[PDB]
Amino acid sequence: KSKLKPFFALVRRTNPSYGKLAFALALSVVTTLVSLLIPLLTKQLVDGFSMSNLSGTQIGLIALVFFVQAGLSAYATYALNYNGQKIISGLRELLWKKLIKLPVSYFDTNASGETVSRVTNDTMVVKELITTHISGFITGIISVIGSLTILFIMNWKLTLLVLVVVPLAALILVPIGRKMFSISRETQDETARFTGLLNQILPEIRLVKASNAEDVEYGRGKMGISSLFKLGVREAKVQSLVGPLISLVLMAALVAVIGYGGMQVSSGELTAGALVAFILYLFQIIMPMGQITTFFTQLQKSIGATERMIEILAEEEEDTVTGKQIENAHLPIQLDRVSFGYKPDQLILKEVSAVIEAGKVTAIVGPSGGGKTTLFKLLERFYSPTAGTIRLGDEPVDTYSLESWREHIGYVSQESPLMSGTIRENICYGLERDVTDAEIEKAAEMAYALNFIKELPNQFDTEVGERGIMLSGGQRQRIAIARALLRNPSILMLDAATSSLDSQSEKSVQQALEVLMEGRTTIVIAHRLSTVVDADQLLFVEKGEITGRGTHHELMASHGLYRDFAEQQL
Amino acid sequence: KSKLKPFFALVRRTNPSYGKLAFALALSVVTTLVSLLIPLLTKQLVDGFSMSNLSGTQIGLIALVFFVQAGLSAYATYALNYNGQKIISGLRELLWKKLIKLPVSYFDTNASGETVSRVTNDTMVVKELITTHISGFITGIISVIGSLTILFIMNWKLTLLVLVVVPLAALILVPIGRKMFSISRETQDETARFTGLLNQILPEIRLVKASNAEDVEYGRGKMGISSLFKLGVREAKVQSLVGPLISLVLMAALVAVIGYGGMQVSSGELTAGALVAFILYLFQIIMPMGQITTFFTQLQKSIGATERMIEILAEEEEDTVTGKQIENAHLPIQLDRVSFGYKPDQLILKEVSAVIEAGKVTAIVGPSGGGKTTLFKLLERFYSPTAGTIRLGDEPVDTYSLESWREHIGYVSQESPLMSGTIRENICYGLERDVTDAEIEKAAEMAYALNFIKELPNQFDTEVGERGIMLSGGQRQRIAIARALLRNPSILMLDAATSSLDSQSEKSVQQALEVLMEGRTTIVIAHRLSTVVDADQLLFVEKGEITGRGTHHELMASHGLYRDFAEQQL
Ligand SMILES: Nc1ncnc2c1ncn2[C@@H]1O[C@H](COP(=O)(O)OP(=O)(O)OP(=O)(O)O)[C@@H](O)[C@H]1O
Ligand SMILES: Nc1ncnc2c1ncn2[C@@H]1O[C@H](COP(=O)(O)OP(=O)(O)OP(=O)(O)O)[C@@H](O)[C@H]1O
Ligand SMILES: [Mg+2]
Ligand SMILES: [Mg+2]
């Protein structure tokens, strides 16, 4: 198809300073036309010089005019820069919104460091293109058109050769444009890859120091840098080659013009003098043509980078389109025939079916890799079930809206994450309703976290750093549990919520959680049968299917392998 | 102090294209001298009009020389671009080599993502400056000096007036330069912060969806982008202001010159055309001016952008040359009178001291937050103890080189982190010696992970993804255990690693680890006492002080209230 149309559509979507840029373009056009026409009337210049020699109060007029011209040029440049900055800001805003609203599968498949490099660097390159080269192209086009009209006025014939030159120049230029576009895309991709590699390596700085692999990572960084340098060198080579081709085409055009004028001297013989003038005017043609061609090259390079952006700007996203609010929050969750494969081929969950009854703690247990966490991901509708559907009292879950189903659910991850900022911010993360201070204190007390959080500068200091490195594993897990409890949901999912907690801390947190969420549904995933001994409905999962489904004693009698786990613990 | 010195020192620290840079400077100088010949080329061209009608080979040769000049200018531009790209590549390589070597404390305290953004964006800024603006400055300075010579020869008083005007412009530039430097530094810092926030958010998309905080994160991104927009607009305003100030200074210079020449009206100004001639030449002197000053401004920007690198490139890396290589690796580890705190004041470990017997499974056990992990960090020499010393039987650890100490130690982190790439990639890059296929298979089998990897596309088609997300919460732990075991370490410091593992996987991994314990020494941190009941030197770390120090039975019969831990596990 085409690329200019999508690129200009994106720029329009950015909502730029359309009128302001148009006004700046008009200012630049008028000033350039006046400045081009002024030198032509040299007789006016000489008579003005004589008048200034005669007239006394003429310095002020010229000085004011020059100051006004300088101010107009400065304001035009400022307007162009402002418009470019607004365009890049709009691009960044749109890209950030789309990225943050994409489904989890896209991020699972394409990582996140490449996307961030995409946004930042593509926006930067578009900014570089927008500001100066557009002004260069406009001035060049105006100057070329004016000079072409002047040359036509001087002669109606010789301009035919320039009109022949234009297609020749375009034909010479096209391959350069294609090569520049390819190089720009390859660069703006390798830069993203390198940034992603660095980002994933940095915490493996503790990781590497644990090992002895500083040299290997330095070598990987050097290889990425070398690839980027090679791409830059190739782009520079193409940009350099751009010029000499234009010079050669213009020289050939002038040679053809002179050859034809050799015969034209038959009628316009003395017109050779005018011919000389033509040559001079032709040299003027040669200033802005370069400018114009330069713009084209840039107009390709930007496209390259921007191309990737467009791909991100059309995925699809999930929101509360449906609007069907839960409004009940107390129903049994019935899992029908359901099956999941992250790739379309393989299946992790194979024909699962059960009933999480409200008011009881259903515990999913089994060997590692059986498919426990993916069950929670389905239950929170991170992905969409393929085989069947999940209902909440004879109502398909898809009927309800994401913003309502997720609000009524608390979810502690098996890899309990914390984000940079205050502990209070992490506990309160995302909540729209104001928390005051009583709620945070209650949540911390019910998560057995207040004991240490008050041994530090409170619950507004002790920046958790990146990935929660500035806190212990037990503290991190307890902060995650505190966040989940503070959310105050009807459905509470806790997958391996006490993995890294001591026996006493585990007992206290379990007692508090049972007392709180006793009158609400709770789904716990525990590798230790001790915590789930006092369960209500075990859902032993093995290789993506609930082989055993019953209470402690009944499931122990039925399964046979569950006995192996319990007896091994015993 | 000064700024211009450190920046040029940093640039020299790389390996710039000295030959190509000199070649480009020479070509630019010759081009400017051709421009200076152009004034004589006016009479030469009148003669060319007179005689070229009588000569064709002359026009052919002149056109060939023109094309050769065009090619030379193109080559000069290409050489400048190549030199700039090599300079930025050298900066990136040097910065990466430095970063991969700082002590873990700096990365604990300085938001690695901001550092990566620093390197990438500031290298980009230096690349943006170097080529174009050095070329512009060189051409402008040479043209200005050339025109100044002519102005000097034409008249003394007006040239002196122009010189006295020049430092007025120099004085005017100073506040603008300072403002541009401040703006550039602030913009670079804001870009670093924005990239850091974006990279903290995107990888945790799973938590964002669960917390339903899409709007809050979109708002944070919008605020960051608005800060960037404000800085960009302020920079644009400063550049615009740079725009008419030079014009005003030159207008004042012209007025002063006109007045002084009017003083010469009695004598000297008698050559009124010469005065007018001077005015014409005056115009010329400012065409290069618009370049020279510009370069200076850009220089300041660059000096700001790279300011942080100047701080970054001094951090006292400390690897490889405390010249002692461990040669026995079978000595008991004597922990002396050690007290460590991440902050200078607060103490995590308080007067800890003990002995780890070479060949005994010392188990550090205690409530969360006691300081178990920090002891392991001290053992790996991530941080140096601030109280005493660690000796392997009457030999301080500081004597041995870091490389030797860390090549003999297997360390499984609490996080159990994984990097992107194939499963085999982690256990390959961990070491430097070749590992075969058989050794990798044995290591995997020694961690009860071979079956699951065999189910997948056989250890090379599987990609763990960023942060090890494609794998489960137990499979990644088993992979970390396999990496630890593959190194064949003398000391196996196994921080809690059977957390997410199941009972049967725990049993298998424990049997393999017991075989290795029969091999050599081992240190394990266990949250559950059931897994270390058969240990030898059970330690109890509470609040940084080891209260109980003895075997399991004697520790239980001797220690006080914390015997409830065992009873609680009962
Ligand atoms: N993108 C993915 N995210 C999660 N699991 C994935 C992905 N791609 C493939 N898988 C497969 O899904 C399983 C991991 O999720 P699963 O539900 O089995 O884990 P789990 O029960 O929480 O594990 P464990 O008990 O070991 O912590 C593995 O079989 C893995 O190969
Ligand atoms: N940068 C830091 N890294 C680690 N711990 C830190 C840091 N700064 C302060 N600390 C303190 O150190 C302790 C966390 O490390 P510690 O050695 O106590 O954990 P741990 O024994 O591994 O914990 P757990 O049993 O929960 O896994 C906390 O008391 C915390 O406040
Ligand atoms: Mg710990
Ligand atoms: Mg799991």
Side-chain angles (χ1 to χ4, degrees):
Chain A
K1 274 153 161 273
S2 299
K3 300 156 294 181
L4 272 305
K5 184 174 147 190
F7 177 56
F8 278 97
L10 182 49
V11 161
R12 196 138 45 71
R13 184 122 44 95
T14 89
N15 246 359
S17 307
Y18 212 50
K20 188 147 173 323
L21 171 142
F23 163 89
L25 301 183
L27 320 153
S28 40
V29 152
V30 54
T31 170
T32 291
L33 164 157
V34 174
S35 170
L36 165 76
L37 277 195
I38 287 284
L40 170 66
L41 318 188
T42 182
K43 303 296 299 179
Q44 306 288 355
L45 295 183
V46 63
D47 61 57
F49 301 153
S50 306
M51 182 261 257
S52 169
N53 300 340
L54 269 45
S55 302
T57 172
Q58 264 45 47
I59 165 64
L61 184 151
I62 308 169
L64 177 63
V65 86
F66 296 160
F67 211 59
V68 167
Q69 199 284 336
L72 260 49
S73 175
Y75 184 80
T77 290
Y78 169 51
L80 276 184
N81 273 353
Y82 182 84
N83 181 81
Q85 295 286 1
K86 182 144 193 172
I87 282 184
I88 84 165
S89 166
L91 276 177
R92 286 176 185 183
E93 261 170 339
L94 304 148
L95 206 58
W96 175 223
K97 188 195 322 171
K98 182 66 53 178
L99 277 176
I100 188 42
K101 266 209 162 191
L102 291 213
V104 291
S105 62
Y106 171 96
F107 284 150
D108 181 307
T109 289
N110 298 346
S112 66
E114 307 184 12
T115 66
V116 73
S117 167
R118 285 298 145 66
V119 49
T120 57
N121 285 184
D122 320 332
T123 53
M124 208 52 116
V125 63
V126 161
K127 183 269 300 184
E128 205 284 339
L129 155 62
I130 284 287
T131 89
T132 75
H133 292 276
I134 204 52
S135 173
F137 166 83
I138 54 188
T139 64
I141 198 74
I142 285 305
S143 176
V144 180
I145 197 73
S147 87
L148 201 54
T149 45
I150 290 179
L151 276 283
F152 184 10
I153 322 315
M154 263 157 314
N155 165 255
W156 182 88
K157 168 253 171 175
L158 302 178
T159 55
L160 294 173
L161 278 72
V162 156
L163 267 281
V164 163
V165 186
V166 152
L168 214 161
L171 160 73
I172 287 294
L173 172 155
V174 163
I176 277 174
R178 290 178 174 184
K179 212 158 182 281
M180 171 85 47
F181 160 82
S182 294
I183 291 310
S184 169
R185 164 131 56 79
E186 284 199 2
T187 286
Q188 296 296 353
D189 171 270
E190 276 297 331
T191 283
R193 197 181 334 291
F194 162 55
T195 286
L197 155 76
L198 275 196
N199 267 359
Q200 63 193 289
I201 277 175
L202 276 196
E204 317 331 305
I205 184 56
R206 185 161 301 98
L207 180 43
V208 289
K209 303 297 176 184
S211 288
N212 287 104
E214 312 93 310
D215 307 340
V216 179
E217 311 294 24
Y218 172 65
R220 261 157 91 201
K222 184 168 59 182
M223 276 192 3
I225 301 298
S226 168
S227 174
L228 189 37
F229 168 57
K230 293 179 180 316
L231 260 55
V233 153
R234 173 139 68 260
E235 192 271 358
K237 277 185 185 174
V238 160
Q239 170 71 2
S240 100
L241 202 173
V242 152
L245 291 193
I246 287 294
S247 146
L248 164 157
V249 86
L250 261 167
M251 151 287 268
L254 167 142
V255 160
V257 152
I258 298 333
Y260 295 93
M263 295 174 8
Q264 322 322 128
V265 80
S266 177
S267 175
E269 200 281 324
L270 189 44
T271 71
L275 277 195
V276 196
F278 177 80
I279 301 316
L280 152 72
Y281 258 110
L282 265 280
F283 264 60
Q284 307 175 32
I285 271 293
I286 174 186
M287 170 36 49
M289 210 55 199
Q291 286 303 102
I292 297 176
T293 195
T294 286
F295 169 76
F296 186 95
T297 290
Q298 302 287 346
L299 171 53
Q300 291 292 346
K301 181 136 72 62
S302 183
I303 288 284
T306 313
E307 159 165 89
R308 188 46 213 251
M309 301 205 47
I310 295 120
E311 200 90 20
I312 299 169
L313 281 194
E315 279 266 2
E316 250 209 68
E317 52 268 353
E318 65 281 348
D319 39 357
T320 174
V321 287
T322 88
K324 193 45 188 171
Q325 317 300 79
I326 169 176
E327 190 176 346
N328 299 344
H330 195 356
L331 278 275
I333 295 185
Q334 169 193 125
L335 265 67
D336 207 340
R337 317 308 110 81
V338 199
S339 292
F340 177 80
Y342 301 85
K343 295 295 185 183
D345 158 8
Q346 52 279 41
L347 293 213
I348 321 89
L349 273 191
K350 290 169 178 168
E351 199 68 5
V352 73
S353 288
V355 289
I356 290 90
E357 280 142 29
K360 297 180 183 51
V361 292
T362 67
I364 325 284
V365 188
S368 70
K372 301 181 253 189
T373 312
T374 184
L375 203 149
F376 278 27
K377 287 182 177 176
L378 305 194
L379 206 38
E380 219 170 10
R381 303 148 48 86
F382 273 62
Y383 308 91
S384 295
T386 64
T389 36
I390 318 174
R391 308 188 209 92
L392 187 62
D394 311 73
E395 183 65 13
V397 72
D398 229 346
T399 51
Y400 301 85
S401 66
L402 274 274
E403 293 59 10
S404 305
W405 176 268
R406 292 220 246 271
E407 261 178 3
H408 288 236
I409 287 177
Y411 178 60
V412 171
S413 316
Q414 198 165 21
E415 56 295 33
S416 317
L418 288 190
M419 330 186 38
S420 177
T422 89
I423 280 188
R424 178 205 208 95
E425 191 275 9
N426 274 186
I427 287 187
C428 295
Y429 195 63
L431 298 197
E432 273 309 82
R433 81 199 179 75
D434 206 338
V435 51
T436 76
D437 221 49
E439 271 110 332
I440 298 171
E441 293 297 19
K442 172 53 60 55
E445 186 271 342
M446 229 188 322
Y448 214 67
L450 192 54
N451 291 8
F452 333 110
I453 315 185
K454 274 187 175 180
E455 294 195 31
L456 280 46
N458 267 266
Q459 326 186 6
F460 39 72
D461 273 334
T462 67
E463 182 186 356
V464 190
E466 182 145 318
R467 306 261 292 300
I469 165 62
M470 195 92 57
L471 277 175
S472 169
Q475 191 87 7
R476 227 180 301 118
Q477 214 155 355
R478 290 146 86 150
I479 283 192
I481 290 190
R483 172 208 290 113
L485 297 178
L486 160 72
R487 169 163 317 271
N488 191 24
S490 312
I491 292 313
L492 180 83
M493 311 155 308
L494 303 162
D495 63 39
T498 63
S499 71
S500 64
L501 290 184
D502 74 53
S503 299
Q504 186 271 339
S505 298
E506 276 178 291
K507 92 160 189 52
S508 86
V509 63
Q510 181 77 10
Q511 296 186 354
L513 261 163
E514 283 306 322
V515 172
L516 167 75
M517 223 35 52
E518 158 266 339
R520 271 180 260 249
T521 320
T522 324
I523 327 173
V524 307
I525 287 185
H527 317 66
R528 53 211 319 172
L529 295 180
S530 305
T531 75
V532 289
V533 290
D534 301 352
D536 300 313
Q537 194 180 356
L538 298 178
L539 305 179
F540 197 97
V541 160
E542 173 183 7
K543 287 306 308 182
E545 57 169 8
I546 320 196
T547 68
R549 176 191 302 98
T551 320
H552 185 76
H553 316 298
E554 303 84 301
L555 198 141
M556 168 137 39
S558 54
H559 198 293
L561 180 139
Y562 176 52
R563 328 186 61 266
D564 191 358
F565 279 140
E567 296 164 17
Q568 233 287 354
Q569 300 275 187
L570 180 43
Chain B
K1 206 82 91 173
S2 309
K3 324 155 202 161
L4 266 298
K5 161 97 157 294
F7 175 63
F8 279 101
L10 175 57
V11 161
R12 261 164 74 250
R13 191 100 64 77
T14 63
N15 296 306
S17 308
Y18 176 77
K20 285 190 179 54
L21 193 33
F23 194 110
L25 308 163
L27 311 146
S28 320
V29 170
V30 199
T31 282
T32 206
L33 275 304
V34 177
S35 69
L36 170 57
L37 181 150
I38 278 192
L40 182 62
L41 188 60
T42 304
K43 275 68 61 183
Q44 298 336 300
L45 277 165
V46 83
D47 312 329
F49 317 140
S50 310
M51 279 159 297
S52 174
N53 185 23
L54 287 57
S55 296
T57 184
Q58 280 64 18
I59 203 56
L61 85 84
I62 198 80
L64 159 60
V65 163
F66 293 140
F67 174 109
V68 166
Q69 197 278 345
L72 213 63
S73 163
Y75 179 84
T77 282
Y78 158 63
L80 265 175
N81 265 11
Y82 180 86
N83 188 57
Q85 296 270 18
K86 203 186 181 168
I87 274 175
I88 79 168
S89 150
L91 283 191
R92 278 164 177 175
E93 275 167 327
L94 198 41
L95 213 38
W96 182 228
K97 167 50 180 313
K98 180 66 53 174
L99 283 170
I100 214 59
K101 283 226 174 201
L102 305 69
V104 305
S105 71
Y106 170 92
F107 277 157
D108 168 296
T109 316
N110 278 24
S112 63
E114 314 180 6
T115 84
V116 63
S117 159
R118 200 77 64 208
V119 311
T120 298
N121 303 115
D122 319 333
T123 57
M124 281 325 318
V125 171
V126 161
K127 175 264 175 188
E128 175 197 11
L129 160 73
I130 293 282
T131 76
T132 88
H133 283 317
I134 188 54
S135 167
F137 169 86
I138 210 54
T139 65
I141 206 64
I142 278 306
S143 180
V144 152
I145 189 92
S147 302
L148 201 56
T149 84
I150 302 176
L151 290 212
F152 184 10
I153 86 161
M154 294 300 293
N155 174 10
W156 280 24
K157 329 303 157 194
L158 319 181
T159 324
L160 170 144
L161 263 293
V162 152
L163 292 211
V164 164
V165 159
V166 152
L168 203 161
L171 160 69
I172 288 294
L173 258 47
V174 165
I176 273 184
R178 296 174 178 180
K179 211 72 72 173
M180 214 97 87
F181 168 84
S182 288
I183 287 312
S184 178
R185 172 130 62 70
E186 284 196 1
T187 285
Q188 285 319 316
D189 180 276
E190 276 308 326
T191 281
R193 293 203 312 102
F194 168 45
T195 290
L197 160 80
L198 247 185
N199 274 133
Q200 283 164 30
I201 272 296
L202 271 191
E204 285 301 7
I205 192 48
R206 228 156 312 281
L207 173 62
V208 175
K209 302 293 178 186
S211 296
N212 192 31
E214 290 141 327
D215 312 334
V216 176
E217 303 311 335
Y218 174 43
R220 293 236 294 279
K222 175 179 300 177
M223 300 296 178
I225 300 171
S226 273
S227 268
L228 269 282
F229 181 40
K230 306 282 202 42
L231 264 46
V233 82
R234 178 133 68 255
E235 191 177 19
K237 280 185 183 172
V238 169
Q239 215 162 311
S240 100
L241 201 53
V242 152
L245 276 203
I246 286 302
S247 147
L248 169 162
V249 86
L250 293 148
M251 180 254 268
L254 258 186
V255 154
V257 155
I258 288 311
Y260 209 91
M263 171 285 268
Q264 272 70 217
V265 155
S266 165
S267 303
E269 178 268 2
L270 183 55
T271 54
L275 217 75
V276 166
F278 177 80
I279 300 333
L280 159 63
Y281 253 100
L282 271 283
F283 265 50
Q284 311 177 36
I285 180 157
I286 78 164
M287 181 31 244
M289 213 65 188
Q291 303 308 102
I292 288 172
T293 187
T294 280
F295 164 84
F296 173 83
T297 289
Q298 296 284 339
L299 165 71
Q300 284 293 339
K301 172 137 75 62
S302 170
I303 278 303
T306 75
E307 176 76 348
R308 261 311 286 285
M309 281 135 288
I310 267 70
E311 171 185 341
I312 300 307
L313 291 190
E315 287 284 349
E316 322 212 350
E317 49 269 18
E318 71 296 340
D319 206 343
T320 195
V321 39
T322 87
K324 278 319 294 175
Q325 325 297 89
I326 169 173
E327 292 180 7
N328 185 294
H330 203 322
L331 289 285
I333 290 192
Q334 157 103 341
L335 270 159
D336 207 354
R337 164 71 51 51
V338 202
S339 58
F340 182 39
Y342 301 88
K343 285 216 161 32
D345 162 38
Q346 309 88 295
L347 259 62
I348 321 291
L349 283 172
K350 291 170 181 173
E351 292 187 11
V352 65
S353 296
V355 181
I356 286 90
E357 313 279 358
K360 278 80 175 198
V361 281
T362 64
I364 325 283
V365 167
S368 71
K372 306 181 255 189
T373 293
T374 177
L375 193 145
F376 269 57
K377 290 189 180 182
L378 293 178
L379 259 48
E380 202 101 352
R381 281 140 75 71
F382 280 102
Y383 304 109
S384 295
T386 53
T389 53
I390 286 130
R391 313 181 205 90
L392 303 88
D394 317 327
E395 182 34 77
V397 70
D398 201 13
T399 52
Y400 304 70
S401 61
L402 271 283
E403 212 166 60
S404 295
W405 183 261
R406 311 213 202 139
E407 278 186 350
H408 286 236
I409 285 195
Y411 174 57
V412 165
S413 325
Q414 199 151 358
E415 310 170 309
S416 316
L418 291 182
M419 304 212 250
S420 69
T422 207
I423 281 185
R424 178 208 215 99
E425 200 280 342
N426 307 341
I427 40 186
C428 279
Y429 94 104
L431 311 93
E432 192 74 342
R433 53 179 199 60
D434 203 318
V435 309
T436 83
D437 192 87
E439 188 66 16
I440 280 192
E441 311 256 10
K442 191 62 183 66
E445 179 264 353
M446 215 196 296
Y448 207 72
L450 204 30
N451 44 7
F452 296 97
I453 316 189
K454 183 178 179 180
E455 210 138 358
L456 317 178
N458 285 290
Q459 266 187 352
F460 59 88
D461 182 50
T462 299
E463 186 173 350
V464 193
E466 178 142 318
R467 195 151 281 141
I469 191 42
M470 298 269 256
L471 293 185
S472 59
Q475 188 104 30
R476 94 183 65 192
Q477 219 147 331
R478 281 196 295 296
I479 284 198
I481 286 193
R483 172 209 287 110
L485 303 188
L486 163 72
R487 295 159 62 63
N488 200 18
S490 310
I491 289 303
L492 195 54
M493 68 215 39
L494 199 48
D495 171 73
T498 61
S499 63
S500 59
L501 281 183
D502 52 64
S503 301
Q504 192 270 335
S505 309
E506 281 182 359
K507 168 192 178 62
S508 309
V509 71
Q510 189 63 29
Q511 296 190 0
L513 301 188
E514 169 272 341
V515 152
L516 259 51
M517 161 55 158
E518 248 290 351
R520 325 144 296 285
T521 319
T522 278
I523 313 177
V524 290
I525 291 183
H527 303 286
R528 65 180 103 209
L529 315 193
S530 307
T531 194
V532 286
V533 288
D534 205 338
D536 318 325
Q537 208 175 356
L538 251 68
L539 311 182
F540 199 84
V541 167
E542 179 187 10
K543 291 311 304 183
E545 304 161 7
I546 331 180
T547 66
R549 181 184 300 101
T551 325
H552 168 84
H553 273 307
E554 59 196 21
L555 161 87
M556 292 177 72
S558 61
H559 204 272
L561 328 168
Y562 282 108
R563 187 184 300 99
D564 71 0
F565 267 29
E567 299 157 0
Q568 233 295 342
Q569 281 294 329
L570 245 179

